[PDB]
Design a protein around this ligand. Structure first.
Ligand code: HEM
Ligand SMILES: COc1ccccc1O
Length: 403
């Protein structure tokens, strides 16, 4: 429909998943808000357009079509009004900074040590599967009340929900081009129900200090609980992004540091620099790269485009965090970049609710790793591939150390 962008017709889902950067570099220059045919949606590629859409009074929350097919209703990321207010009040207590500070160290640090103890003397490791992912899911899983769900299973669930949620390709008629791509999402949800339904049964009659027990009971009249069908979509929100992204953030940070060996040494020498390294890592490869969206509630003009009411816009925060109007050489990792606002946690009233928790999980994990293996080296016999358009991170991170 937009003639000068006819090249967008030839962009593929696989290309966006393998490497979205060239297409989005072109988008940021030619059309900060652009309809991408294979995604079937407008996409916002620049920091200005992403932040405007995420905070605009003329936009409200929505899930991308494949995300809605995966999570259903009411997922906290895609609802508004009183429902959203209730779901926010539901998840917020255990994420409050003063509360996190009470227990985050006794939570994450023994978990990090346990996973490190399995390989820290091996001299070689694949840190995504052996460390970054297990620490992320074990920390959150224990907080939720899923202590007895093995980290292998939690990692499998977030991988299947990832692929279902991002099964976004549409054909010439706007229909999903890969309809069998949702089946492993459906299978993951079926497995989650068989595991979590008996836990919910128990928590209803015998509440405890797990987060999910508090989702059932907090703020309810005496003897009442939130119906499980009302909270499961937000459980799924957690079992995808909240489980996956701290691991993505850690690993992308390590990859960025390895690309600046002078800066990796600095951080290992002075671990007070770990929060700064993580912040740049999230800017450099944003874990929730283009999974979020908003929908317009009235006619609105964005980046010169007159959008009718009811128009979805995908928020490609990962591209926004490479906006060359904001950063110098944003494709390069630079620990010493001046700290600026970034959009890796989103913006607006649907901005990330778990920032403080997530940053601590990533910080403690990297502190323990560098203490256990100060001579960590990237295994340059293998290259690092990143995968994902909706959610993005390294598929593996092979490392060595002397020893
Ligand atoms: C580095 C790790 C993480 C990153 C980069 C991240 C990023 C994001 C992003 C981009 C969104 C959508 C924001 C928007 O649409 O504008 C989001 C939403 C959310 N995240 Fe985080 N997230 C991370 C970890 C976590 C963790 C560990 C939790 C929970 C313990 C969590 C809880 C939530 C919740 C509840 C929402 C929904 C907020 C709402 O819709 O009102 N996140 N996150
Ligand atoms: C925090 O988890 C998510 C955020 C945005 C989209 C999907 C998620 O699971």
């Amino acid at each position: 429909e937009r003639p000068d962008l006819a090249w967008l017709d030839e962009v593929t889902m696989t290309q966006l998943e393998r490497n979205p950067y060239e297409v989005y570099e072109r988008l940021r220059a030619e059309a900060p808000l652009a309809f991408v045919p294979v995604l079937g949606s407008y996409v916002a590629s620049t920091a200005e357009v992403c932040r405007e859409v995420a905070t605009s009074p003329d936009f409200e929350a929505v899930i991308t079509p494949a995300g809605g097919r995966t999570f259903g209703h009411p997922a906290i990321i895609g609802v508004n009004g009183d429902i959203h207010a209730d779901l926010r009040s539901m998840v917020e207590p255990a994420l409050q900074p003063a509360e996190v500070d009470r227990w985050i160290d006794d939570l994450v640090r023994p978990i990090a040590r346990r996973y490190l103890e399995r390989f820290e003397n091996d001299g070689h490791a694949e840190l995504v599967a052996q460390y970054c992912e297990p620490v992320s899911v074990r920390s959150l899983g224990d907080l939720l009340g899923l202590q007895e769900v093995d980290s292998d299973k939690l990692r499998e669930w977030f991988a299947k929900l990832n692929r279902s949620f991002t099964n976004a390709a549409v054909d010439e008629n706007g229909e999903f081009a890969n309809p069998e791509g949702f089946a492993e999402g459906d299978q993951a949800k079926a497995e989650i129900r068989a595991v979590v339904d008996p836990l919910i049964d128990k928590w209803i009659e015998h509440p405890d200090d797990s987060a999910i027990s508090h989702w059932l009971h907090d703020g309810m009249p005496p003897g009442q609980t939130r119906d499980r069908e009302y909270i499961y979509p937000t459980i799924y929100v957690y079992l995808l992004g909240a489980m996956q992204e701290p691991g993505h953030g850690m690993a992308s940070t390590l990859v960025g540091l390895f690309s600046r060996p002078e800066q990796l040494e600095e951080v290992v020498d002075d671990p007070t620099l770990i929060p700064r390294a993580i912040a740049e890592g999230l800017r450099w490869t944003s874990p929730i790269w283009s999974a979020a969206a908003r929908i317009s509630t009235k006619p609105v003009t964005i980046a010169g485009v007159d959008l009718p009411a009811g128009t979805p816009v995908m928020l490609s925060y990962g591209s926004a965090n490479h906006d060359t109007g904001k950063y110098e050489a944003p494709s390069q990792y630079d620990l010493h970049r001046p700290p600026l606002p970034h959009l890796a946690f989103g913006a607006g009233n649907h901005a990330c609710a778990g920032i403080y928790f997530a940053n601590h999980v990533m910080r403690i994990a990297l502190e323990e790793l560098f203490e256990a293996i100060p001579n960590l080296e990237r295994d340059t016999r293998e290259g690092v591939e990143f995968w994902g358009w909706g959610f993005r991170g390294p598929t593996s991170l092979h490392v060595t150390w002397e020893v």
